[PDB]
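The material for today's practical consists of a large collection of protein records. An example says more than a description, so a record of this kind follows:
***
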Amino acid sequence: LARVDLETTRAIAKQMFSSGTVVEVSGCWFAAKVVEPVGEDKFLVEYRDLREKDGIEPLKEETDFLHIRPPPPRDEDIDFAVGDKINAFYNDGWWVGVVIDGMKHGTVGIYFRQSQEKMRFGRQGLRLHKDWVDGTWQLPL
C-alpha cells in the first residue's frame, strides 16, 4: 500500500462501486456485490459465497475503499510456472499464494505463506495474481 495513492484510490472506489456492482473484498479476496456506499469511504457489501452462521443467509459487511476492487480480468491459457504469484480458490475465497510445482494431471502445487501449508489445486480454481492500483490492473512487482 505504498504502491497505491490514498486520494486516487478513494476517488476511484467512489466512482466504480455503485449499488449492484460486482466486486472483490479483502491475503484473500472474496466475491461480493455492493449493497450501498456508506459515508465517503465505506461500502456495505453482500458476499457471493460467504454466509452467516446458518449457512443460508449471505454475509453482509462494511468494508473501506482500500479493501474493495473490481473482479480482475481473466486468462484461460495460463502457463503456470514455479515462483508465479497466483490466487487459489480456497475456503470460498481467492487466496494469495505461490506455484511450487508445475501442472500435473490438471493440478498445480501451491504454497500459502499466510497459513504455512502446501497442497495441489485444480486448474479451475487458479488464476494469476493481479494488483488493483490507482484504477489499473498491475502484475506483481
